[PDB]
């Protein structure tokens, strides 16, 4: 039970290699709750454990790193997740957050509205998503791949994520997308990570580490989601907030990762090697401009 001192649990490799059929998610610990430190909310605890886990990976961390956070608005109109990200990220890191409804944030810039109304030509080094629609869960119908904001997430990754960049996208039993799992195979490494504080939920963060811009491995998203549920159904995770009490090593270490603009024909096997180790980011470094569309009508 040494997992209880971890920030969470990552899906073991052997589970990723199965060919399971999708089944209903039935968690043994479904209904339990972890004991959070006094006055700490779940959204802060959850993001703290995600960042503690991301610290163990080979994230590229360049100067003036660029991070974008989707589905950042809470019901109360604030942005707890954004507050944790800004705590975690090196000072001066550009942080932009976004959601469908208005909220107050610590981000450098906040975008309100859906994908079709926001645009940028700039590339990003890290994408975090907590976007989730509770109405997606419907146990009376078949649990198929969801094609709403997920299609936009996939498009954003393939067009606006810098080579060497990483993502952490929130999924659940019912909130998932086959193409997103497939796109996990375009990273040097990937996993599905479950926070210890929210282990009673089917929620997980699909983490793609070091984007290669091409399929390193072929992943069938339908199968992999089934594999994810199989793992959750057969591996009870003990609810734990233990990792929250030791924040001494929390800040993301500055690596000063090199950024450079390379032509597609210049991306060779040795560049891929650098990308895969979190030692290189490929994108331009122009002024960051975000556009917001407004439908005008009388």
């Amino acid at each position: 039970s040494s997992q209880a001192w971890q920030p969470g649990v990552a899906m073991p490799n052997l589970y990723k290699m199965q060919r399971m059929l999708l089944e209903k998610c039935d968690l043994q610990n479904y209904g339990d709750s972890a004991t959070l430190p006094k006055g700490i909310m779940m959204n802060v605890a959850k993001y703290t454990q995600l960042c503690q886990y991301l610290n163990t990976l080979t994230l590229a961390v360049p100067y003036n790193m660029r991070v974008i956070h989707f589905g950042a608005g809470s019901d109360k109109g604030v942005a707890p997740g954004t507050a944790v990200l800004r705590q975690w990220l090196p000072t001066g890191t550009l942080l932009v957050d976004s959601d469908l409804n208005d909220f107050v944030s610590d981000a450098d810039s906040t975008l309100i509205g859906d994908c079709a109304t926001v645009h940028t030509a700039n590339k990003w080094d890290l994408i975090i998503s907590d976007m989730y629609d509770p109405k997606t869960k419907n146990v009376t119908k078949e649990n198929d791949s969801k094609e709403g904001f997920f299609t936009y997430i996939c498009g954003f990754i393939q067009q606006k994520l810098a080579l060497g960049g990483s993502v952490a996208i929130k999924i659940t039993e019912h909130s998932w997308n086959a193409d997103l799992y497939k796109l996990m195979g375009h990273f040097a490494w990937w996993t599905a990570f479950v926070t210890n504080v929210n282990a009673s939920s089917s929620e997980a963060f699909l983490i793609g580490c070091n984007y290669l811009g091409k399929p390193r491995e072929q992943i069938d998203g339908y199968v992999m989601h089934a594999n994810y549920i199989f793992w959750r159904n057969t591996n009870p995770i003990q609810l734990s907030s233990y990792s929250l009490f030791d924040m001494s090593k929390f800040p993301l270490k500055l690596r000063g990762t090199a950024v450079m603009s390379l032509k597609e024909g210049q991306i060779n096997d040795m560049i891929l090697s650098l990308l895969s180790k979190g030692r290189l980011i490929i994108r331009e470094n122009n002024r960051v401009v975000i556009s917001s569309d407004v439908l005008v009508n009388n």
Binding site: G77, R86, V104
Partner: protein, 110 residues
């Protein structure tokens, strides 16, 4: 400004809630407003924007340029006053010398 909030609390109103409290070591410098949580053993750290009356109420900030000194930062609040961060920040003022709250860390008058 404080004007109305103080009267709201004086009458017996509910202090603004949902201020974002952060996890931290509680071994920080203890300064009032910092780029990262700096709560000491007698303080709590909160996300700045959530503790700012102006940001929360979506009203302009009292500054010709409209600069917010909380948004994007962390505010340290004495644990004894953590039940109302917005109120505490309004009522108190930060020391321009040591960057500590007056009567809550600042000892420049000794």
């Amino acid at each position: 400004a404080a004007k109305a909030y103080k009267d709201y609390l004086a009458s017996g109103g509910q202090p603004i809630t949902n201020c974002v409290k952060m996890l931290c070591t509680h071994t920080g410098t203890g300064q009032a407003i910092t780029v990262t949580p700096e709560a000491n053993m007698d303080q709590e750290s909160f996300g700045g924007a959530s503790c700012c009356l102006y940001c929360r109420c979506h009203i302009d900030h009292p500054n010709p340029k409209g600069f917010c000194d909380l948004k994007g930062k962390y505010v340290q609040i004495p644990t004894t006053c953590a039940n109302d961060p917005v109120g505490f920040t309004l009522k108190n003022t930060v020391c321009t010398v040591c960057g500590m709250w007056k009567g809550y860390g600042c000892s420049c008058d000794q």
